[PDB]
Amino acid sequence: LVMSSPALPAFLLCSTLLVIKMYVVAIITGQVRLRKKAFANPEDALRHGGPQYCRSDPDVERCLRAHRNDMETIYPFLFLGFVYSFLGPNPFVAWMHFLVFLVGRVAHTVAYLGKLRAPIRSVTYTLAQLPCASMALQILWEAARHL
Amino acid sequence: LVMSSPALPAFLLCSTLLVIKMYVVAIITGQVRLRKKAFANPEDALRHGGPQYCRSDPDVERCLRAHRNDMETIYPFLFLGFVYSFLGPNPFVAWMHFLVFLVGRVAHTVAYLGKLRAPIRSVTYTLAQLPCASMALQILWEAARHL
Amino acid sequence: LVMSSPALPAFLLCSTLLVIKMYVVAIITGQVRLRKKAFANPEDALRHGGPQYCRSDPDVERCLRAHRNDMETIYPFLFLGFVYSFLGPNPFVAWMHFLVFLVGRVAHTVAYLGKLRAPIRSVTYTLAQLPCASMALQILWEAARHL
Numbered sequence: 001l002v003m004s005s006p007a008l009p010a011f012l013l014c015s016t017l018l019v020i021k022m023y024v025v026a027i028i029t030g031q032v033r034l035r036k037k038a039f040a041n042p043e044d045a046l047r048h049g050g051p052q053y054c055r056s057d058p059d060v061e062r063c064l065r066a067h068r069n070d071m072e073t074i075y076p077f078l079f080l081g082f083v084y085s086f087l088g089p090n091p092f093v094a095w096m097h098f099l100v101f102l103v104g105r106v107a108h109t110v111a112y113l114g115k116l117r118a119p120i121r122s123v124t125y126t127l128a129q130l131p132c133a134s135m136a137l138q139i140l141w142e143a144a145r146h147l
Numbered sequence: 148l149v150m151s152s153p154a155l156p157a158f159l160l161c162s163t164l165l166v167i168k169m170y171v172v173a174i175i176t177g178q179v180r181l182r183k184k185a186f187a188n189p190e191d192a193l194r195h196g197g198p199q200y201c202r203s204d205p206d207v208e209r210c211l212r213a214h215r216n217d218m219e220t221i222y223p224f225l226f227l228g229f230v231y232s233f234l235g236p237n238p239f240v241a242w243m244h245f246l247v248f249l250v251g252r253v254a255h256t257v258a259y260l261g262k263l264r265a266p267i268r269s270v271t272y273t274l275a276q277l278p279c280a281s282m283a284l285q286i287l288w289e290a291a292r293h294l
Numbered sequence: 295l296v297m298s299s300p301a302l303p304a305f306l307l308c309s310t311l312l313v314i315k316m317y318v319v320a321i322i323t324g325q326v327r328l329r330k331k332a333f334a335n336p337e338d339a340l341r342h343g344g345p346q347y348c349r350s351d352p353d354v355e356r357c358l359r360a361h362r363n364d365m366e367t368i369y370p371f372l373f374l375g376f377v378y379s380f381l382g383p384n385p386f387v388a389w390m391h392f393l394v395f396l397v398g399r400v401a402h403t404v405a406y407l408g409k410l411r412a413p414i415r416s417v418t419y420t421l422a423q424l425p426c427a428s429m430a431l432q433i434l435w436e437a438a439r440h441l
C-alpha cells in the first residue's frame with residue numbers, strides 16, 4: 001500500500017511523473033522522425049517516402065541523447081528513491097529530495113530539447129544528481145550497519 | 148513474499164520473462180558481432196581477425212536498437228507494474244495489463260530483429276505502451292490522493 | 295525496513311555501490327569530453343572553444359559503451375536482486391550471488407575503460423550474468439508456482 005511509509009506517496013508521484021515525461025520524449029522522438037523524414041530502419045523509410053529517408057538527423061539524435069540521459073539518471077532514481085522512502089527519513093527532507101530531482105530533470109529535458117545555452121543543461125543535470133548522491137550514501141550507511 | 152498481493156505472481160512471471168528476453172537480445176548481439184566480424188572495440192577486433200574488423204554493421208546496429216528500445220520500455224514497466232501490483236487492482240484486469248505488455252514486447256523484438264514490414268513494429272510498441280500508460284495514471288491518482 | 299529479509303542488507307549494499315559506480319562512469323565521461331574537447335552538442339562546443347569541438351572521440355565513445363553496458367546489466371540486477379532477496383534464499387548463497395555480480399561488474403568497467411586485452415572484458419560480463427540468470431530462474435519458479 002502507498003501509506004507503507006510517510007515519504008512513499010511523494011516518491012511515487014514524482015517518479016511516475018518522470019516516467020510519463022520519458023514517454024513524452026519517446027513520442028516527441030517519433031514525431032520528429034516523421035516530420036524530418038529521418039528513420040533508423042529501411043522498412044520504416046520505404047513506408048514513408050523511400051530508402052533515402054533511412055538517414056540520421058541532428059534533431060532526432062538530440063532527442064535520443066535526452067532520452068538516453070533520462071535512462072542514465074531517472075532509472076537509478078526509481079531504485080534509490082524507493083529504498084530511501086522506507087529508511088524513515090524526515091518527511092519534508094524526503095520531499096525536498098524528490099522535488100529537486102523532479103524539477104531538475106524536467107528542466108534538463110527543456111534545456112536539452114530547447115537547445116538552451118551552456119551550461120544550463122549541465123547545471124540541471126548536476127542539481128538533479130545531488131539528491132541522488134545523498135540518497136545513495138544514506139542507503140549505504142543503513143545497509144552496511146545491518147550486515 | 149510473492150503472495151503479498153494477488154497480482155504480484157503474474158507481474159513477477161511476465162517481468163522476469165521479459166528480463167530473460169533482454170538477455171537473449173544481448174546474446175544475439177554478441178553472436179551477430181562474431182558472425183559478421185563487426186566489433187566496437189579494437190581489442191576485440193585484434194583477437195578476432197585484425198583491426199579492420201573494428202567496424203559498424205547494419206545487423207549489429209539493429210540488435211542494439213532493439214535492445215535500447217527494450218531499455219526505454221521494459222525498465223519503466225518493471226517499476227510501474229511492481230507498484231501497480233500493490234494498489235489492489237482487479238486480478239483479471241491486472242493480468243490483462245501484464246499479458247498485453249508481455250505479448251506486445253515479445254512481438255516487438257520479433258518484428259524488429261525479423262525486419263518485418265512497417266508499421267508492424269510501431270504497432271507492437273504502441274500496444275505495449277497502452278497498459279503502461281494505464282498503470283502510470285492509476286499510480287498517479289493513488290499517490291496524489293495520499294499526499 | 296532493511297531487515298525485512300536476511301539477504302536484503304547485502305543486496306542494498308552491492309546495488310547502491312554499483313549505482314555509485316555508474317555515476318562515476320558518467321563523471322568520467324564528462325571529464326573526458328572536456329579534456330579531449332569532444333562534445334555532442336553545438337551549444338556545449340561553442341562554450342568550450344568553438345563549433346569544431348562538436349565532434350566524436352574514441353575515448354568518449356568507449357565511456358558511453360561502458361555506461362550503456364552498465365544499463366543493459368546493472369538495471370536488471372536492481373530488479374532481480376530485490377525480488378530475489380524476498381524469496382528466502384540461503385544467506386550465504388544470496389551473498390555469493392550479489393558479490394559475484396559486484397566484483398564482475400567493477401572488473402568489467404576496469405577492463406573496458408582500461409582497454410584490457412580480449413577476452414577479459416567479455417569474461418567479466420559473462421561471470422556477472424551468471425548470478426543474474428540464476429536469480430531470474432529462481433524468481434520464475436516461485437512466481438509460476440504461486441499462479
Ligand SMILES: CC(C)(C)C(=O)N[C@H]1CCC[C@H]1CNc1cc(Cl)ccc1C(=O)O
Pocket residue numbers: 026027029030031033034039044047265266269270272273
Ligand atoms: C509515437 C510513435 C509510435 C513513437 C511514432 O510516432 N513513431 C513514428 C516513427 C516511425 C514510425 C512512426 C509511427 N507510425 C505508425 C504507428 C502506428 Cl501505432 C500505426 C501506424 C503507423 C504508420 O506509419 O502508419
Ligand SMILES: CC(C)(C)C(=O)N[C@H]1CCC[C@H]1CNc1cc(Cl)ccc1C(=O)O
Pocket residue numbers: 173174176177178180181186191194412413416417419420
Ligand atoms: C555472449 C557474448 C559474451 C555477448 C558474446 O558472444 N560476445 C562476443 C562479442 C565479442 C566477444 C565475443 C565473446 N568472446 C568470448 C567470450 C568469453 Cl566469455 C570467453 C572467450 C571469448 C573469446 O573471444 O574467446
Ligand SMILES: CC(C)(C)C(=O)N[C@H]1CCC[C@H]1CNc1cc(Cl)ccc1C(=O)O
Pocket residue numbers: 118119122123125126320321323324325327328333338341
Ligand atoms: C560532471 C559533468 C557535469 C558530467 C561534466 O564534467 N560535464 C562536462 C561535459 C560538457 C559540459 C561539462 C560541464 N560543464 C559545466 C558544468 C556545471 Cl555543473 C557548471 C558549469 C560548467 C561549465 O561548462 O562551465
Ligand SMILES: CCCCCCCCO[C@@H]1O[C@H](CO)[C@@H](O)[C@H](O)[C@H]1O
Pocket residue numbers: 021024025109110113114115
Ligand atoms: C517533457 C518534454 C519537454 C518538451 C520541451 C521542448 C522544448 C521546445 O522548445 C523549443 O525548442 C526549439 C529548438 O528545439 C526552439 O526553436 C524554440 O524556440 C523552443 O520553443
Ligand SMILES: CCCCCCCCO[C@@H]1O[C@H](CO)[C@@H](O)[C@H](O)[C@H]1O
Pocket residue numbers: 168171172256257260261262
Ligand atoms: C527473443 C529474441 C527474438 C528472436 C527473433 C528473431 C527473428 C528472426 O527472424 C528472421 O529474421 C531474418 C532477418 O533478420 C529473416 O531473414 C528470416 O526470414 C527470419 O526468420
Ligand SMILES: CCCCCCCCO[C@@H]1O[C@H](CO)[C@@H](O)[C@H](O)[C@H]1O
Pocket residue numbers: 315318319403404407408409
Ligand atoms: C569505477 C570507474 C573505474 C575506472 C577504471 C579506469 C581504468 C583506467 O586505467 C587506465 O586506462 C588507460 C587507457 O584508457 C591506460 O592507458 C592506463 O594504463 C590505465 O591505468
Ligand SMILES: N[C@@H](CCC(=O)N[C@@H](CS)C(=O)NCC(=O)O)C(=O)O
Pocket residue numbers: 065066068069072121122125126319320321323324334358361
Ligand atoms: N552520457 C553522458 C554522461 C555525462 C552527463 O550525464 N552529462 C550531462 C551534463 S553535461 C549531460 O546532460 N549530458 C548530455 C547527454 O547525456 O547527452 C554524456 O555523454 O554527456
Ligand SMILES: N[C@@H](CCC(=O)N[C@@H](CS)C(=O)NCC(=O)O)C(=O)O
Pocket residue numbers: 025026027029030040064067212213215216219268269272273
Ligand atoms: N527511441 C525511439 C523512440 C520512439 C519509439 O520507441 N518508437 C518505436 C515505435 S516507431 C520504435 O520501435 N522505435 C525503434 C527504436 O527505438 O529503435 C526511436 O528513436 O524510435
Ligand SMILES: N[C@@H](CCC(=O)N[C@@H](CS)C(=O)NCC(=O)O)C(=O)O
Pocket residue numbers: 172173174176177187211214359360362363366415416419420
Ligand atoms: N550491447 C552489447 C551486447 C552484448 C554484450 O553485453 N557483450 C559484452 C561482452 S562481449 C560487452 O562487454 N559488450 C560491450 C558493449 O556493450 O559495449 C554489445 O553490443 O556488445
